DNA sequence: TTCCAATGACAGCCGC
DNA sequence: GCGGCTGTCATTG
């Protein structure tokens, strides 16, 4: 039967619980948050509505130990157990002793780590296990887990416990989700039991699949690094953003007024229908789609398609970048600056990390706006600044996916190119546009980058035609030349597709499996799509494994030389100048740190050394380090 | 439906 | 009408 032991109701029961807890090598916790320094719990940073009122502990069976964190107001609180005494015993059981292997199971580890630090002033110091991450590791293409989906798949006999608990079918922790009529006590107690028992089953499945090493040494440590990043946030200038906005908005106004005079009437730039009516019916341009590729052809024939393309580019920077950044910005009173606090997302097909609310990975590259024949540089990245005195440090792998592909295909031609050869995208752009390397613009080098990765990951003649501006037949010849020049690669493509068809999956460098049952499908599209996913998942997934290992190994090093706080949050949660390096952003093959002026040399050495040593391949992992007063103004830095 | 991966704004439709 | 869904468009790696 489900039982909730209120450990704080009696001094004697409390000490028995504390003695037992201190013996445990494994337990689950769940935080109890409810809607309303207070007597009834700890406010949460970012919600004036919700309190941490307690937490539940489970170490077996259907017994939840509910540990109240309320001063006053289940049987009542034994008044000899002061809140200060409880917080002592809580910090004591949640921090490691020397040579003691201890694992805590937490649904949504990152959100719980942050609330414990910022709300209760407690820093977890044990090995962590999140059942959400274990689910991902067993099937990366599975839908994002909820407590309901985990219990459905791995603990189905306990589904009755979730009856009438509709919020269990949302992403957020049952304990953390105060948008329920059920008490935090009940929610946290149920969660603690479901998560402890679920994680036993998930651990057996990880062991069967041989993913337990990956889970404990890479994925959960990677989640800890991402928790520090989410506590850190990224510095933001609103002045820089506003001045860019005003230039962009002036260009949008001129574009609209010129578009409407060419069209003869107002039209919505957001309606494909309206644009199609104007381009194809009312001006009779030859094709009805209004995609980038269509308008890119037509801009040679009439000014309006080009105006449409520029309108969408600039509207994107204003409505999808400026508006969300200026809405999500938050004063940090300690650092004395505005910051943005994006949320990491690790549930991806290939093991990349992305961000939401907002997705800072999608902040535009620098681009140019001309008005009255005068150019203005729009660098949205220039709004992302370090704390006063600090620098942004970026360290990026040179052609990580190409180096991994060389290693796995042993392709002698690709190895030569990487070992000496200058920029491969410049070589492609030069041959293509009848030029020498030096003339290539940013936009053209990106077009050549798209062509090179496109061809490698199974792009067809029809599409390569559009990108290169040549006939399908010409593109098909170019594919043949590539396939002939790099045979190793082509053998590895066919050997990866053969092995996938047989097994129903592919594996990355660390052993993670992606299931591609489309590989057997009779439909030509679905089959070809799966074959392309098969090849791309191995290379892109392997690269994502290397960057995670690098991230984890850098964080260990930073914390040894750490005569200082491991995140900006660790100073908020604490309640003396800033020293060290703070993980602020991941960009797939690139890590950004915010670094104190004094420490930039040492942090740059650590970051480069650890990224170059992450794994041993047939080829050297080359790393470029850059540094600057903004993400937009980074300069090469020889380390 | 024929590079892969990702988030997110935004009209327009459809069963409730 | 209304929230859900579904492309379509954008951007980044
Ligand atoms: N399949 C595929 N992968 C891409 C594409 N663009 C980028 N990627 C992958 C492979 C490279 C990786 C990182 O992107 P970057 O622009 O940093 O690639 P890079 O080759 O390292 O470029 P750079 O040398 O300028 O850093 O992301 C694309 O269009 N298709
Ligand atoms: C196959 C002929 N060709 C090249 O070899 C260009 O250089 C490279 N192209 C590709 C797709 C790759 Br994958 C490479 C690689 F990086 F692998 F060596 C190169 C090179 N060098 C080429 C040159 C210009 C334009 C196009 C589409 C292809
Ligand atoms: Mg790169």
Q: What is the DSSP letter of A411?
A: -
Residue A450, ligand 1, Cβ within 6 A: yes
- How far apart are the C-alpha atoms of A593 and A611, rounded to whole Å? 13
Domain map (residue ranges) of chain A: 3-209, 235-335, 341-411+492-639, 415-485
A365 contact to strand C (CB, 7 A limit): yes
Chain B bases having any atom below 7 Å from a protein CB: 1-12
Is the preceding omega at residue A358 within 30 degrees of 0, hence cis? yes
**Which CATH number is A235-335 given?**
1.20.1060.10
Which CA distances in Å does A517 have to A141, A345, A528?
A: 11, 25, 12
**Per-residue b or e along A314-334, where b marks 16 or more CB atoms closer than 10 Å to that residue's CB:** beebeeebbeebbebbeebee
A227, A116 Cβ separation under 8 angstroms: no
A442, A433 Cβ separation under 8 angstroms: no
Give residues (CB < 6 A) around ligand 2.
Answer: A 402, 414, 417, 424, 427-428, 431-432, 451-452, 455-456, 468, 478, 481-482, 485-486
Å separating the CA of residue A274 from the C1' of nucleotide B13 = 17
Distance from residue A398's CA to the centre of ligand 3 (Å): 5
Tokens representing A131 are 């059942």
Name the residue of A423, A429, A589 whose CB sits within 8 Å of the most ligand 1 atoms, as the mutation to test its pocket. A589
Distance from residue A402's CA to the centre of ligand 1 (Å): 9
Atom of ligand 2 nearest to the CA of A475: 27
Q: Which residues of A are annotated as a binding site for Mg(2+)?
A: 396-397, 589
Active site residue A139: no
**Phi and psi for A590 in degrees, rounded to 5?**
-145, 135
User: Of residues A130, A396, A411, A599, which has the active-site annotation?
Assistant: A396
Q: Which of A241, A511, A212, A202 is nearest to A351 (CA)?
A: A511
Q: Judge if A3-209 and A235-335 fold alike in CATH terms.
A: no
Is A3-209 assigned to CATH 3.30.420.10? yes
Q: Which of A135, A150, A158, A142 is nearest to A62 (CA)?
A: A158
State the residue for tokens 């780590």: A113
- How far apart are the C-alpha atoms of A632 and A380, rounded to whole Å? 7
Residue A453, ligand 1, Cβ within 6 A: yes
Ligand nearest to the CA of A463: 2
Topology of domain A341-411+492-639 in CATH is Alpha-Beta Plaits (3.30.70)
A362 contact to strand C (CB, 7 A limit): yes
CA atoms within 13 A on the CB side of A586: 29
Which CA distances in Å does A7 have to A21, A55, A187?
A: 11, 11, 17
Query: What resolution, expressed in A, was reported for this entry?
Result: 3.0
Q: Other CB atoms closer than 10 Å to residue A345's CB: what's the count?
A: 15
């Amino acid at each position: 039967s489900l039982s909730i032991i209120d450990v704080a109701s009696d001094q004697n029961l409390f000490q028995t619980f504390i003695k037992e807890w201190r013996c445990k090598k494994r337990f689950s916790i769940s935080l109890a948050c409810e809607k309303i320094i207070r007597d009834d719990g700890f406010p949460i940073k970012g919600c004036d509505d919700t309190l941490v009122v307690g937490l539940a502990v489970c170490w077996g069976g259907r017994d939840a130990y509910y540990f109240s964190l309320q001063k006053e107001q289940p049987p009542s609180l034994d008044p000899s157990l002061t809140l200060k005494d409880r917080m002592w015993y809580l910090q004591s059981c949640l921090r490691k002793e020397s040579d003691k292997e201890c694992s805590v199971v937490i649904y949504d580890f990152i959100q719980s780590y942050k609330i414990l630090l910022l709300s209760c002033g407690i820093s977890l110091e044990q090995s962590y296990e999140d059942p959400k991450v274990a689910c991902w590791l067993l099937d990366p293409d599975s839908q994002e887990p909820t407590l309901h989906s985990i219990v459905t798949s791995f603990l189905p006999h306990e589904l009755p416990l979730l009856e009438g608990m509709e919020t269990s079918q949302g992403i957020q922790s049952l304990g953390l989700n105060a948008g329920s009529e059920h008490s935090g006590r009940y929610r946290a107690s149920v969660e603690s039991i479901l998560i402890f028992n679920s994680m036993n089953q998930l651990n057996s499945l990880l062991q069967k699949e041989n993913l337990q090493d990956v889970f404990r040494k890479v994925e959960m440590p990677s989640q800890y690094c991402l928790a520090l990043l989410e506590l850190n946030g990224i510095g933001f200038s609103t002045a820089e953003c506003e001045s860019q906005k005003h230039i962009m908005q002036a260009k949008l106004d001129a574009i609209e007024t010129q578009a409407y005079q060419l069209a003869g009437h107002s039209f919505s730039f957001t309606s494909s229908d309206d644009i199609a009516e104007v381009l194809f019916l009312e001006l009779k341009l030859p094709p009805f789609s209004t995609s980038k590729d269509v308008l890119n052809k037509l801009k040679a024939l009439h000014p309006l398609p080009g105006l449409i393309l520029e309108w969408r580019r600039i509207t994107n920077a204003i409505t999808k970048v400026v508006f969300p950044l200026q809405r999500e910005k938050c004063l940090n009173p300690f650092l004395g600056m505005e910051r943005i606090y994006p949320v990491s997302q690790s549930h991806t097909a290939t093991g990349r990390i992305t961000f939401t609310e907002p997705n800072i990975q999608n902040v535009p590259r620098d681009f140019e706006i001309k008005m009255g024949g005068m150019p203005f540089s729009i660098s949205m990245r220039h709004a992302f600044v370090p704390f006063p005195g600090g620098s942004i440090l970026a360290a990026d792998y040179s052609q990580l996916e190409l180096r991994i592909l060389a290693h796995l295909s042993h392709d002698r031609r690709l190895i030569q190119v990487l070992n000496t050869g200058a920029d491969v995208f410049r070589s492609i752009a030069a041959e293509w546009k009848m030029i020498e390397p030096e003339s290539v613009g940013d936009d053209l080098r990106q077009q050549a980058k798209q062509i090179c990765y496109g061809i490698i990951y199974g792009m067809g003649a029809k599409s390569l035609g559009e990108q290169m501006g040549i006939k399908e037949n010409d593109a098909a010849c170019y594919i043949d030349s590539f396939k002939s020049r790099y045979t190793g690669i082509n053998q590895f493509m066919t050997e990866t597709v053969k092995n996938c068809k047989r097994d129903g999956f592919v594996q990355t460098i660390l052993g993670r499996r992606r299931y591609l049952p489309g590989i057997k499908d009779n439909n030509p599209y679905r089959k070809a799509h799966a074959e392309r996913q098969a090849i791309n998942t191995i290379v892109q997934g392997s690269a994502a494994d290397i960057v995670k290992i690098a991230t984890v190994n850098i964080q260990k090093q930073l914390e040894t030389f750490h005569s200082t706080f491991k995140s900006h949050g660790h100073r908020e949660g604490m309640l003396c100048p800033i020293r060290g390096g703070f993980f602020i952003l991941q960009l797939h093959d690139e890590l950004l740190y915010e670094v104190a002026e004094e420490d930039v040399v040492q942090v740059a050495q650590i970051v480069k050394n650890e990224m170059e040593s992450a794994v041993k391949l047939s080829v050297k992992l080359k790393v470029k380090v850059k540094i600057g007063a903004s993400w937009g103004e980074l300069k090469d830095f020889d380390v």
